[PDB]
Amino acid sequence: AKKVQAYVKLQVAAGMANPSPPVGPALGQQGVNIMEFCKAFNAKTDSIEKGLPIPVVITVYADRSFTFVTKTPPAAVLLKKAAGIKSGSGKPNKDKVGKISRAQLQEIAQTKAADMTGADIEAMTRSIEGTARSMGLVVED
Template identity: 30%
Template sequence: NDGTQVPVKIVYEDDGSFELEVGSPPTAALIKKELGIEKGSGYAKRSFVANISVEQIKKIAIQKLPGLLSYDVKNAAKEVAGTCVALGITIDGKNPRDFKEKVDSGAYDDILSE
């Protein structure tokens, strides 16, 4: 019990039975937990509140992969990076908007290979 919030869906049946479906925590929650921060930047495009490594991005991408539209870790990492943009978090000290192009060019293939 680490306090991580997760989405929960309760499905009630006509006979009174029910089923609980526990989802994966939101990507933003995983990033904030990984970095030990409470919240993102209120000015994400201008003010950065933390830095995350590509290795940490990969860890979160692997956790989220089953619930994402992405079909591999590289593309899942780009989705995680998109959340970093919204939170105001740099990736390896650089603007997270540049991450997608670097991934596409193969700059992180050694780290993001499965």
């Protein structure tokens, strides 16, 4: 974006019960206090996308007011469930063995069709290929 306000990021682990960022001094400099966002907010994300982890970011306004907004669920989240195994190959910084076919890329290319409407699937199978070798995954070219 040509103009951006760059609001504080609030990433914390799954199923975590006592998080430290939602009381940190960065929210102090943003000028807000967070009450409900990190302990049961799994229900407030399940109320906007199910069976798929969605990213959420803060937007801040006057009178210490705040609103939470969604992003595109990253292709990595789909790749970590594409082969019917837990986290795919798991952690990065790992020996590579798990290979993604152009048929598997063409299954997740369907995520682009609502913006890439020109009805070419081989094109969307390359426009989904951005950093596809992340998470220690192997790619078919």
